[PDB]
Design an enzyme around this catalytic site. Structure first.
Site, PDB file in Angstrom:
ATOM      1  N   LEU A  79     -41.621 -54.384  -0.446  1.00 20.70           N
ATOM      2  CA  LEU A  79     -40.759 -54.522   0.542  1.00 20.70           C
ATOM      3  C   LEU A  79     -41.593 -54.670   1.936  1.00 20.70           C
ATOM      4  O   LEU A  79     -42.465 -53.919   2.259  1.00 20.70           O
ATOM      5  CB  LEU A  79     -39.624 -53.481   0.721  1.00 20.70           C
ATOM      6  CG  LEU A  79     -38.954 -53.208  -0.689  1.00 20.70           C
ATOM      7  CD1 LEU A  79     -37.871 -52.291  -0.559  1.00 20.70           C
ATOM      8  CD2 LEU A  79     -38.388 -54.704  -1.142  1.00 20.70           C
ATOM      9  N   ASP A  80     -40.986 -55.538   2.923  1.00 19.25           N
ATOM     10  CA  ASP A  80     -41.578 -55.774   4.100  1.00 19.25           C
ATOM     11  C   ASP A  80     -40.694 -54.635   5.090  1.00 19.25           C
ATOM     12  O   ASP A  80     -39.815 -53.900   4.664  1.00 19.25           O
ATOM     13  CB  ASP A  80     -41.481 -56.955   4.854  1.00 19.25           C
ATOM     14  CG  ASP A  80     -40.280 -57.695   4.860  1.00 19.25           C
ATOM     15  OD1 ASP A  80     -39.297 -57.525   3.899  1.00 19.25           O
ATOM     16  OD2 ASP A  80     -39.982 -57.907   6.127  1.00 19.25           O
TER      17      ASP A  80
END
Lengths: 168, 14, 56, 459, 75, 178, 64, 85, 98, 603, 62
Positions: free
Chosen positions: H39-40
């Site tokens: 995830l960013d």
């Protein structure tokens, strides 16, 4: 025990009950229940208290003040006569206030009693109060916080001089 | 806290 | 221990004695101002039997 | 009147000769008994005053004020106990003696039958009040406040002394009964105008008038709790009593001369009620509210109508009680947190619940919630002014709104919100403080049931 | 899972309320009982014209019994 | 529980805050979940489009324009969580919260009603009173010569040492005191 | 403490009678008083004129 | 609504598992979204928003950015809701 | 600048030495008796006995007397046809106008 | 007749008993709320009796039990006017308070000071009864100010909330601005009619002048949240939901309309005051309905509906149809109280969530609340043969069939359409659709208190209008014949509003995003009246206080004028006199000058 | 920045930005939470005017 003449009340005309329906009237039974539960005990209690009051009955009297010379007949700087006359004037001021109060009470009771016809059937009481209010205003209005018999006399003299000038 | 009483600076003005 | 109680709690007699004394002196001043006791033109009455003053 | 005066004088020897432990107890007990004696004066013949002697008389105006003073003395002792505990026995006795001398002077002022004696006793009150403020105040500004109070009052009073001596020379007597009975009308001449100014201005100063009220905030803020209580409850009311008494002499010129003071009071009530909105000190806010209510009283006196006078008397009594209670409530918070800044102590309702109710009742009386005697007096004054001019309603209604706003703003800020976290010295309210607040509140609420007692002679 | 409730001390305020109520009632309840007894038994006087040749005492001009007593005793 | 703030907000943090504000206001406008999901995916695509812009000037101008668009498109009455600032229930229970120091002023009879609790409270008081000196020493040691340049406080370095300035955080009034 | 002092004590020591201060003080202090004098005096004079000319209704105004 | 610690952990894992980008099998209490998962940042923002919607309480942005872990979310929720078990 | 004693700490709470302080003093006996004196002589005596004294104070204001006199005057004037309130406070004849 | 006075007084006196017993131990115990509720229920049962007596024989009475004080020619006494208005409103208000207290027991169970809450509610009921049953303006003022103060206390029930305190202060401020008019009316009546009793005021003031009626109108606008003083009612929702439903929804707000109804005989004479009342009612209805249309908080929507209904009642007064206004007050009490209680139930189920956007799919989740809300909304929108039909339908028909300001009539019809609109808004967003509330589902309406409290008001909403309308004596000449379109105007407008609201609400489903319109901003922002009016006047007033009155005058210019300048002159003169030179040569010359000057001047 | 020296009594007191206490960040742990203020921070001359209860200057949507 109030005097009827001093506090007039028109004779009471109450329509007789004329039921036209079979259904029982709730108000009648509720009123009978009220009589039994409340009115009878209250009446018995008042009976007992009135018996107790009758056992020791004592009387109180209404004081009578003999009329005293007015300010008009009091010489200048005559503090004794001025004091007596001013006290008389103050008593009369209170009495006239009470008279106006009685007439106003008649007025309000008539407004309530007549109902939706108050405007026409209360005319006589309104006229009585109009007369009384005009008289009271002329006699005592505008004297001020330090109202005195001398100032009311001066106002009356001013009014009388104005009336003479109107006579021309 | 205590009621203020004159200090040396207050006294010196007199 | 009464001697002790009164010796250190006698101050509670001053003010009530003051009230008593004040009443007395006020009655004396009422004595002074009796000139028109029953000589008014409003309350002037004939002294009822067994009476010397209307206390006015 | 000696039934009250002599016991009050005997209070001093009792206090001086009492044991160190028992000074407050004896003073409170005997002062309360004296107050009980004063209640006899409330029985007033409608037509005539109670002329006890040549020197002293009482009427439906003086009686309530005398009762108020006699009542105030014990409350003042109860309030002053706390902060004078450290003081030495001699100083505590001197403080109590100053309070007792002040009560004696006020009673003789209210019951005095001669204007010169009234002046002597009315000015004499300055000395004990000045001593209290400048010796038992807690701030460096107590001395400047004392100077302002003394000099404002004296500059007002002295021309009054000159005018009274002149009246004695001309009319021949300064007895109020003779003055009232003879009371020749004044003429519109510059000399009579200045005589009117001389008579009025001293009481105008005593009753904080806008432009002459600067002494009141300083003195009330800087004075000890008892001194603030007397100043608010009784000392201000001396001006109203004198102005109501003195107005007999100046009959006709009052219409012409009233306009400056009438306008000043009417606009100043709005100005001071607005000032209360933005004040940062609780005592100062209470003082400015006192100023506004006394401006209402001044308007009532200047209008010179019976309803206005009744409202003035009722307002004087009600305000004395309410302002004294407010000062005591603020003093409790000051003792706990040792600051008069309103913002510093917050959310006190959670910490001290019952004091919150005391504050609520005091503020409600301050904003004239009916059927409070405050509302009765204010409403009667408002109706009299409406008769004087229908346009008066705008300013008076605006003042009512501003008074409600500032009273409830004080209540919200001090007693509502989250508690100030760092303050840890808040402790459960003592029975003494709650008893003082109750002694303030209960007589005020009770007086509503029988309001003829505080409605004055014109009733 | 009862959790302790942190609240300010209520002993002192409740104590003041109890003391104030006690001291009010201490003389009120006797006063209320006295008033009720007086009104029930002694009653209020009846207005009667002054008998000729009689000068009433000052207390005899007031209706209520307690008012009459106050007028006689203190005034 | 709030972390100490930083002197400035980084460009990434500002973009993240704008993203959160835009999504919440969109949810306010898009009452129904499906429409919200569709337009929210649209917004995520919008951010991804310039996610990788190399020129910082261009990215800053884009952020500025996006903020202007947000102000024009903000919901007049955005949804506020009930207990959040501006929410219907924000600070509702504040009055019920009472400080711990109040218990010390309880009458002995009142403290008798809850004996075990006050014994535990005495234990906690002892812990704080012992720990204060070491906490002050540690704060002095870690503090830079100029002074504390951030609000962050150091954790306990050694066993037997409580975190410096721990009392009020640990003993804060319960969220729902009742 | 500084806020309270600046808002109460420091005002007069750091006040200088200036054109703005003097003119604003005049306007906001004495201006309203003369406006209210004008208003109330005019109203009262009109009322007195009507009373003198017998052209005012006080039929039941018996409580002043 | 006792909202015990285990309930908070279970609900946070529920929300995360219903998150398509996160593969359910490798999701763990200590799986940092930035490092362990892919995830960013915007995914961090979305997950924080999802958690605040699930529990109905808003996590301030300054605190929200620093979670970076499910267990961190669980403990922060416990601190905010005063969950001691 | 001077040798002065340290500012005394906030006056010791009367609760610490006596938990049931009641205020009014440091010594508990004087505290109790001060509270008792205040409560008795104000609440029990002045407020309750004083309030009763005010409530039943004899009507020397002559309100009932005024009402009775007004009733008599109204009845008489209405019976005789005289106006209820005469416009002249004092009889005109006695007045000598200029 | 003899039982009438006793029962009417006992109904009021019974309520005070719980207040007196607050000092007793029952206040400490849990039984106090149930005791207060039971006292209210017994009071309602007793109140029914005098109402039945009036229905049978119109036994109106005035009771002056106590003489407070006689001020020269003015007698002030405690007098209760047990006329049609009081004898009917007392039972309605008591029934609503009974239901509201039963609901509060469930809603406020967690609250630590529940006994205080119930005591405050009983105090508000007592003050409102004083307001309704008053024959004197002073007693009515007692009730007025007591209601204002109780609203201030209850609205800020959570003292922690700064918003709640601001709302309480705002309510006090607007109501006091209204009370300025009440004071004006009292002063005018005392000065001119020499009385504060309603009876003498009616008797003397055959053709009432304008000023007192305008003051009464200002007071009514303040109490009933008319335009210009309207903001306080919506902000009052910061208080607990039972407080809103009881006072700021159905009972307290009606006071101003009740004040105008009480003075209806005077209102008839003056045409200008009637026109102003009608216009203010139209403004309130249109503005409040428009604001409610775009609001996303259920309590806010209901409060704006209450304000609009108050505006409609004021319009009815303007049309010179007062008794219909009283009837509308009575019916609005029922259905609006039920609506607010249903909103409270939804809020409690959804953990203090009041935004409609976060509420959905509750039609089946909460069957009984859904039924109650459906019935209440239908009654509010004038569904035939419900409580609304007997009041609102007649109000509209009378407005059409009378000489009227054209824009007022147009605005009233549009307001009815907007009422249908916002009822549709609440129903569609909350009960209809799919659930949008947080995952954990705690919906549980199975509480006997909630169900029974809503049940009583549901039965009242369904059947009360028929019973009351049939039993009450005819008090207006009916508008017998009218054009069919005129007769059906209410239904036509309501149905059109329903259709348009339903169409627009369905469009929300469509996956289209459009930035807000300016009109939507105007409605949602409450017309900008709060934003601009609560900031511009407040800022100027407070800043003027501080900058001018506090500093420029009090701390600067007055001090400079009287004290500072005199002290400065004295100090300079002292410096002059005490030159501190002390030279014989210098001051002996002054002796020579003095001697010469004396010789010249004084011979 | 001092207030302009115009004789109005402000003197040395800082002329802080005219922002309402509402504008200050709610989430930050202020020393005094209700007032949104910090110990030792300069206090605005008109803080009583700008408290959260009293005037609000926060930016508006329009």
């Amino acid at each position: 025990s109030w005097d009827k003449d001093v506090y007039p009340e028109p004779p009471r005309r109450t329509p007789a009950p004329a039921p036209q329906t079979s259904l029982p009237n709730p108000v009648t039974y509720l009123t009978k229940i009220f009589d039994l539960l409340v009115d009878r005990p209250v009446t018995l209690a008042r009976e007992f208290i009135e018996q107790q009051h009758a056992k020791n009955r004592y009387y109180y009297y209404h004081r009578e003040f003999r009329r005293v010379p007015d300010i008009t007949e009091c010489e200048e700087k005559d503090i004794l006569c001025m004091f007596e006359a001013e006290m008389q004037w103050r008593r009369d001021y209170k009495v006239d206030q009470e008279i106006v109060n009685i007439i106003q009470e008649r007025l309000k009771a008539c407004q309530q009693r007549e109902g939706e016809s108050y405007r026409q059937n209360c005319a006589k009481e309104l006229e009585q109060f109009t007369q009384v209010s005009k008289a009271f205003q002329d006699r005592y209005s505008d004297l001020g916080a330090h109202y005195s018999a001398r100032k009311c006399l001066a106002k009356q003299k001013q009014r009388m001089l104005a009336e003479r000038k109107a006579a021309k | 806290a205590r009621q203020w009483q004159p200090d040396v600076e207050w006294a010196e003005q007199f | 221990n009464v001697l002790q109680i009164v010796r250190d709690h006698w101050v509670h007699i001053l003010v009530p004695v003051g009230f008593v004394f004040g009443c007395y002196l006020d009655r004396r001043s009422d004595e002074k101002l009796t000139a028109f006791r029953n000589k008014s033109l409003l309350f002037k009455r004939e002294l009822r039997p067994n009476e010397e003053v209307t206390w006015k | 009147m000696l039934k009250i005066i002599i016991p009050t004088t005997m209070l001093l020897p009792m206090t001086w000769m009492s044991k160190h432990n028992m000074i407050w107890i004896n003073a409170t007990v005997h002062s309360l008994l004296i107050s009980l004696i004063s209640l006899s004066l409330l029985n007033q013949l409608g037509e005539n005053s109670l002329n006890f002697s040549l020197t002293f008389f009482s009427d439906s105006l003086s009686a309530p004020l005398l009762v108020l003073t006699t009542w105030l003395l014990p409350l003042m002792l109860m309030a002053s106990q706390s902060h004078l505990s450290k003081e030495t026995t001699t100083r505590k006795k001197l403080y109590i003696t100053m309070l007792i001398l002040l009560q004696l002077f006020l009673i003789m002022t209210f019951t005095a039958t001669e204007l010169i004696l009234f002046y002597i006793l009315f000015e004499a009150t300055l000395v004990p009040t000045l001593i209290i403020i400048t010796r038992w105040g807690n701030q460096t500004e107590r001395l400047n406040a004392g100077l302002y109070f003394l000099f404002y009052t004296l500059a007002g009073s002295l021309p009054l002394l000159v005018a009274l001596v002149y009246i004695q020379n001309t009319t021949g007597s300064l007895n109020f009964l003779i003055i009232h009975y003879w009371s020749h009308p004044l003429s519109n001449s510059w000399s009579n105008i200045f005589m009117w100014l001389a008579c009025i201005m001293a009481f105008m100063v005593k009753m904080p008038l806008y432009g002459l009220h600067l002494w009141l905030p300083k003195a009330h803020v800087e004075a000890p709790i008892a001194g603030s209580m007397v100043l608010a409850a009784v000392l201000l009311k001396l001006g109203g009593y004198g102005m109501m008494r003195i107005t007999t002499i100046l009959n006709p010129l009052t219409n012409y001369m009233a306009y400056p003071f009438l306008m000043l009071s009417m606009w100043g009530m709005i100005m001071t009620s607005s000032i209360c909105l933005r004040q940062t000190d609780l005592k100062s806010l209470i003082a400015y509210s006192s100023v506004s209510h006394m401006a209402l009283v001044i308007v009532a006196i200047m209008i010179q109508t019976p309803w206005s006078f009744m409202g003035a008397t009722a307002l004087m009594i009600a305000h004395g009680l309410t302002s004294s209670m407010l000062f005591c409530l603020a003093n409790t918070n000051y003792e706990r947190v040792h600051s008069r800044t309103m913002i510093l102590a917050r959310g006190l309702q959670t910490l001290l619940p019952l004091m919150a109710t005391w504050w609520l009742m005091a503020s409600l009386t301050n904003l004239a919630l009916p059927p409070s005697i405050n509302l009765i007096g204010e409403l009667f004054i408002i109706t009299a002014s409406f008769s004087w001019s229908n346009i008066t309603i705008i300013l008076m209604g605006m003042n009512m709104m501003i008074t409600a706003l500032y009273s409830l703003y004080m209540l919200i800020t001090t007693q509502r919100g989250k508690y100030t976290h760092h303050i840890n010295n808040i402790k459960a309210s003592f029975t003494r403080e709650n008893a003082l607040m109750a002694l303030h509140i209960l007589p005020l609420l009770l007086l509503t049931l029988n309001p003829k007692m505080i409605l004055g002679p014109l009733y | 899972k009862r959790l302790f409730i942190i609240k300010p001390s209520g002993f002192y305020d409740r104590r003041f309320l109890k003391l104030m109520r006690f001291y009010i009632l201490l003389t009120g309840i006797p006063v209320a009982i006295g008033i009720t007894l007086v009104n029930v038994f002694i009653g209020e006087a009846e207005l009667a014209d002054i008998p000729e040749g009689y000068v009433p005492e000052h207390w005899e001009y007031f209706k209520h019994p307690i008012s009459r007593w106050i007028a006689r005793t203190f005034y | 529980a709030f972390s100490a703030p930083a002197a400035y907000l980084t460009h990434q943090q500002k973009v993240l805050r704008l993203y959160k504000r835009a999504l919440r206001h969109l949810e306010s406008w898009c009452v129904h979940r499906d429409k919200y999901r569709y337009f929210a995916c649209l917004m995520r695509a919008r951010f991804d489009e310039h996610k990788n812009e190399k020129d910082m000037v261009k990215a800053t101008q884009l952020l500025r324009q996006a903020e202007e668009e947000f102000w024009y498109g903000q919901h007049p009455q955005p949804y506020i969580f009930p207990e959040s600032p501006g929410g219907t229930s924000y600070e509702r229970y504040e009055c019920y919260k009472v400080p711990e120091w109040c218990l010390d002023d309880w009458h002995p009879s009142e403290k008798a009603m809850y004996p075990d609790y006050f014994a535990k409270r005495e234990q906690w008081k002892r812990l704080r009173r012992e720990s204060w000196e070491r906490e002050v020493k540690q704060l002095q040691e870690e503090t830079p010569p100029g002074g504390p340049r951030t609000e962050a406080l150091p954790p306990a370095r050694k066993e037997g040492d409580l975190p410096p300035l721990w009392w009020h955080i640990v003993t804060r009034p319960r969220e729902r005191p009742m | 403490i500084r806020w309270t002092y600046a808002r109460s004590a420091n005002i007069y020591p750091n006040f200088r009678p200036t054109p703005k201060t003097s003119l604003l003080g005049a306007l906001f202090g004495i201006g309203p008083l003369f406006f209210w004098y004008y208003v109330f005096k005019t109203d009262r004079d009109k009322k007195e004129k009507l009373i003198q000319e017998g052209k005012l209704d006080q039929t039941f105004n018996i409580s002043y | 609504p006792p909202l015990t610690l285990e309930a908070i952990k279970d609900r946070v894992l529920y929300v995360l598992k219903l998150y398509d980008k996160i593969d359910p099998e490798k999701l763990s209490v200590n799986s940092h979204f930035m490092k362990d998962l892919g995830l960013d940042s915007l995914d961090q923002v979305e997950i924080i928003m999802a958690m605040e919607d699930e529990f109905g309480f808003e996590i301030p942005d300054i605190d929200a950015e620093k979670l970076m872990c499910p267990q961190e979310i669980v403990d922060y929720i416990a601190d905010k809701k005063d969950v001691y078990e | 600048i001077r040798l002065q004693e340290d500012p005394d700490p906030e006056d010791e709470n009367l609760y610490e030495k006596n938990p049931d302080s009641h205020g009014y003093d440091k010594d508990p006996i004087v505290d109790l008796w001060n509270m008792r004196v205040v409560f008795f002589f104000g609440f029990s005596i002045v407020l309750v006995l004083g309030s009763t004294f005010v409530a039943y104070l004899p009507d020397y204001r002559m309100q009932e007397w005024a009402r009775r006199e007004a009733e008599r005057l109204v009845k008489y004037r209405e019976a005789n046809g005289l106006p209820l309130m005469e416009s002249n406070c004092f009889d005109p004849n006695k007045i000598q106008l200029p | 007749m003899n039982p009438f006075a006793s029962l009417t007084l006992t109904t009021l006196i019974i309520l005070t008993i719980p207040i007196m017993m607050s000092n007793s131990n029952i206040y400490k115990t849990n039984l106090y709320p149930n005791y207060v509720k039971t006292t209210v229920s017994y009071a309602f049962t007793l109140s029914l009796v005098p109402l039945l007596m009036f229905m049978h024989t119109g036994q109106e009475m005035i009771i002056s039990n106590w003489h407070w004080m006689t001020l020269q020619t003015v007698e002030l006494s405690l007098s209760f006017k047990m006329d049609y208005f009081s004898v009917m409103f007392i039972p309605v208000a008591l029934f609503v308070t009974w239901s509201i207290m039963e609901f509060s027991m469930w809603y406020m169970h967690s609250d630590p000071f529940i006994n205080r809450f119930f005591k405050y509610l009983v105090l508000f009921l007592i003050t409102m009864m004083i307001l309704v049953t008053a024959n004197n303006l002073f007693q009515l003022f007692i009730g007025w100010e007591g209601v204002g103060i109780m609203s201030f206390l209850l609205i800020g029930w959570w003292h922690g909330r700064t918003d709640a305190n601001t709302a309480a202060l705002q309510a006090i401020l607007y109501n006091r601005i209204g009370d300025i008019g009440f004071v004006l009316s009292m002063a005018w009546f005392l000065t001119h009619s020499n009385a504060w009793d309603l009876q003498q005021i009616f008797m003397l003031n055959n053709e009432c002048p304008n000023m007192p009626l305008i003051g009464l109108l200002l007071a009514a606008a303040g109490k009933s949240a008319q335009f210009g003083l309207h903001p306080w009612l919506p902000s009052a929702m910061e208080g607990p939901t039972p407080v809103s439903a009881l006072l700021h929804s159905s009972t307290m707000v009606v006071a101003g309309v009740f004040l105008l109804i009480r003075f209806y005989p005077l209102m008839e004479t003056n045409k200008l005051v009637q026109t102003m009342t009608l216009c203010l009612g139209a403004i309130t209805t249109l503005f409040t309905a428009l604001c409610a249309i775009t609001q996303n908080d259920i309590k806010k929507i209901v409060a704006f509906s209450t304000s609009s209904q108050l505006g409609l009642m004021m319009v009815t007064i303007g049309i010179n149809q007062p008794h219909l206004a009283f009837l509308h007050i009575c019916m609005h009490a029922f259905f609006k109280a039920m609506l607010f209680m249903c909103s409270g139930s939804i809020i409690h189920s959804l953990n203090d969530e009041q935004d409609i956007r976060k509420m959905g799919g509750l039609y089946k989740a909460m069957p009984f609340t859904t039924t109650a809300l459906i019935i209440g909304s239908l009654a509010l929108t004038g569904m035939p043969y419900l409580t609304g039909f007997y009041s609102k339908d007649l109000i509209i028909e009378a407005v059409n069939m009378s000489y009227t300001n054209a824009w007022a009539l147009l605005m009233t019809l549009i307001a009815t359409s907007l009422t249908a609109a916002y009822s549709t808004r609440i129903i569609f967003f909350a009960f209809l659709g799919k659930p949008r509330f947080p995952p954990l589902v705690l919906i549980n309406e199975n509480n006997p208190l909630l169900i029974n409290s809503i049940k009583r008001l549901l039965i009242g909403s369904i059947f009360a209008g028929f019973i009351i309308s049939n039993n009450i004596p005819p008090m207006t000449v009916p508008n017998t014949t009218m054009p069919l379109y005129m007769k059906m105007t209410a239904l036509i407008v309501t149905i059109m509003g329903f259709m348009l609201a339903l169409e627009l609400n369905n469009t929300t489903y469509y996956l289209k995003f459009k930035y807000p319109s300016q009109t939507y901003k105007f409605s949602n922002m409450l017309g900008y009246y709060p934003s601009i009016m609560h900031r511009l006047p407040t800022y100027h007033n407070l800043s003027m206080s501080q900058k001018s009155a506090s500093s420029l005058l009090d701390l600067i210019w007055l001090e400079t004028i009287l004290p500072k300048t005199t002290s400065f002159i004295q100090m300079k003169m002292s410096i002059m006199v005490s030159n501190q030179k002390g030279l014989i040569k210098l001051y002996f010359l002054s002796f020579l000058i003095t001697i010469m000057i004396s010789m010249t001047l004084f011979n | 920045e001092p207030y302009p020296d115009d004789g109005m009594g402000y003197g040395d007191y800082p002329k802080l930005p005219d922002r309402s206490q509402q504008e200050r960040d709610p989430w930050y742990d202020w020393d005094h939470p209700d007032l949104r203020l910090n110990w030792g921070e300069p206090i605005h001359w008109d803080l009583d005017m700008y408290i959260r209860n009293r005037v609000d200057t926060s930016p508006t949507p329009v």
